[PDB]
Design a protein around this ligand. Structure first.
Ligand SMILES: *[C@@H]1O[C@H](CO)[C@@H](O[C@@H]2O[C@H](CO)[C@@H](O)[C@H](O)[C@H]2NC(C)=O)[C@H](O)[C@H]1NC(C)=O
Ligand SMILES: *[C@@H]1O[C@H](CO)[C@@H](O)[C@H](O)[C@H]1NC(C)=O
Length: 497
């Protein structure tokens, strides 16, 4: 329906300017005819998920790369795609005028948007908050009588989460992560820095913390929200580092292992929220496979663990094979999930680069790498940030797919937003990743998946400058002649039957 209004801010590509009355949206997706394929193209030069269509022919004209689909080779089923409703995001969204707010939300969750179906919810404060707080700051309330939701939840997060779902065509799954416990449950009695829960698993500190989760879930239920899953702790490894600057709670693997086994596991199960799934790690992939060895080879722990959460920040220091691959090998029936699918940094680039194609490309390349190694879903970090990368009470380091310029009642959609869309929009929950055999070494990044209605979706990412002539063969249907233009991402969709 509405094309992208491009703006340049001096970087490799454009953002799409959206404001109170105008934002680029899609039409309902169409189920086109057998022999016909759909193409959604985004390019550094400035095309944004542009829809074209073509023929799948029964003869093969090319001499180039041949990506051959292999519907038989079957891998993981997709849980979904989303982002985090952090204090900072909630705060930027809420700073736009209501009409603008909806264009933003529709952008992510509506079928006119990119159809997100996951939302991560931090449990109380983290670095993307304007203040350090937990849901029970009153010291030595082991019973948690004073536990309650701040205005952050009742006025910012919960209202938007409702609106997100209202707007969403898919059913959306909520995931919660805690950053810190009340500081009185902690060994160092501070929201950050090195320090864990006091005593050890089974004890009153651990039982309380376990109960916190249930209270947290209880509270969101009163506001008519269910969670699909929680993570045992966000970045547990961080709470082990001397003078770590933001909200954290250290667990070593063994510590997490026992906390899950003795406390969180049972208490959750023993609650009305027993159906909520527990995900472990929720940390850097480099800590795998070890972390999984330690938690999952203990039966009493692993009976409680539905999957392993991972982060993207530190991936350059761990390849996928050695981490996610080896972990899947060892633990095939424990799904791997990316709960903090974020980056967009360096030492020398600022937090937010308005219209950087490069970060867009990192995102999609990361999602593909993920999918090729059995990962079932993704949660980007903040749904929205300001132009400074804020607000962050410690220090703004990350980008976000949407940037809110509060003074102008307008928001900007980064290349990233479209790089996630090339997936989030066309790979609903249930989709299964299938085989896709390249005929020769090449510079592209490609993944194939099968929509629950039996039809096909292939994302092709050209991270190089050169156009790469391309042929996708589907033995049930024929051949897609195409080119993958340098610095582009393409989603190809077709019926198979
Ligand atoms: C929100 O964005 C839209 C689109 O960029 C702005 O409307 C455009 O205004 C320019 C210049 O006045 C025209 O070239 C276009 O025809 C308009 N777009 C339309 C009508 O589709 C709009 O001004 C923005 N809202 C505010 C308050 O600035
Ligand atoms: C709950 O929290 C406050 C902190 O404002 C504390 O002083 C109060 O006594 C607490 N509990 C009860 C039973 O009122």
């Amino acid at each position: 329906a509405r094309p992208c209004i491009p703006k340049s801010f001096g970087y490799s590509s454009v953002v799409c300017v959206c404001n109170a009355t105008y934002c680029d949206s899609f039409d309902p997706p169409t189920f086109p005819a057998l022999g016909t394929f759909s193409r959604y193209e985004s390019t550094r030069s400035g095309r944004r998920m542009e829809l074209s269509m073509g023929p799948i022919q029964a003869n093969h004209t090319g001499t180039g790369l041949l990506l051959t689909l292999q519907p038989e080779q079957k891998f993981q089923k997709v849980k979904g795609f989303g982002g985090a409703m952090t204090d900072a995001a909630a705060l930027n969204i809420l700073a736009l005028s209501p009409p603008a707010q909806n264009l933003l939300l529709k952008s992510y969750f509506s079928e006119e948007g990119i159809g997100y179906n996951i939302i991560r919810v931090p449990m109380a404060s983290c670095d993307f908050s304007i203040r350090t707080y937990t849901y029970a700051d009153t010291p030595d309330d082991f019973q948690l009588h004073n536990f309650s939701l701040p205005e952050e939840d009742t006025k910012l997060k919960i209202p938007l989460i409702h609106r997100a779902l209202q707007l969403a065509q898919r059913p959306v799954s909520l995931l919660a992560s805690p950053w810190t416990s009340p500081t009185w449950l902690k060994t160092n009695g501070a929201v950050n820095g090195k320090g864990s829960l006091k005593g050890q698993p089974g004890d009153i500190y651990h039982q309380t913390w376990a109960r916190y989760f249930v209270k947290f879930l209880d509270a969101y239920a009163e506001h008519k929200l269910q969670f699909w899953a929680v993570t045992a702790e966000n970045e547990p490894s961080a709470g082990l580092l001397s003078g770590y600057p933001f909200q954290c709670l250290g667990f070593t693997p063994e510590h997490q292992r026992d906390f899950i086994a003795r406390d969180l596991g049972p208490t959750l199960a023993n609650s009305t929220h027993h159906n909520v799934r527990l995900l472990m790690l929720d940390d850097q992939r480099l800590l795998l496979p070890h972390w999984a060895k330690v938690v999952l080879t203990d039966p009493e722990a692993a009976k409680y663990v539905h999957g392993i959460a991972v982060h993207w920040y530190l991936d350059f220091l761990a390849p996928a094979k050695a981490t996610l691959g080896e972990t899947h090998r060892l633990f095939p029936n424990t799904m791997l999930f990316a709960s903090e699918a974020c980056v967009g940094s360096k030492f020398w680039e600022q937090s937010v680069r308005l219209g950087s194609w490069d970060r867009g490309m990192q995102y999609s390349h990361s999602i593909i790498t993920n999918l090729l190694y059995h990962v079932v879903g993704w949660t980007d970090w903040n749904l929205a940030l300001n132009p400074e990368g804020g607000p962050n009470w410690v220090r703004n380091f990350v980008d976000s797919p949407i940037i809110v310029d509060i003074t102008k009642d307008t928001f900007y959609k980064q290349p990233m937003f479209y790089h996630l869309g090339h997936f989030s929009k066309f790979i609903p929950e249930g989709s299964q990743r299938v085989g896709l055999v390249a005929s020769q070494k090449n510079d592209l990044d490609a993944v194939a998946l099968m929509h629950p209605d039996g039809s096909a979706v292939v994302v092709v990412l050209n991270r190089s400058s050169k156009d790469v002539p391309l042929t996708i063969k589907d033995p049930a249907v024929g051949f897609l002649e195409t080119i993958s233009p340098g610095y582009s991402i393409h989603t190809y969709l077709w019926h198979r039957q």
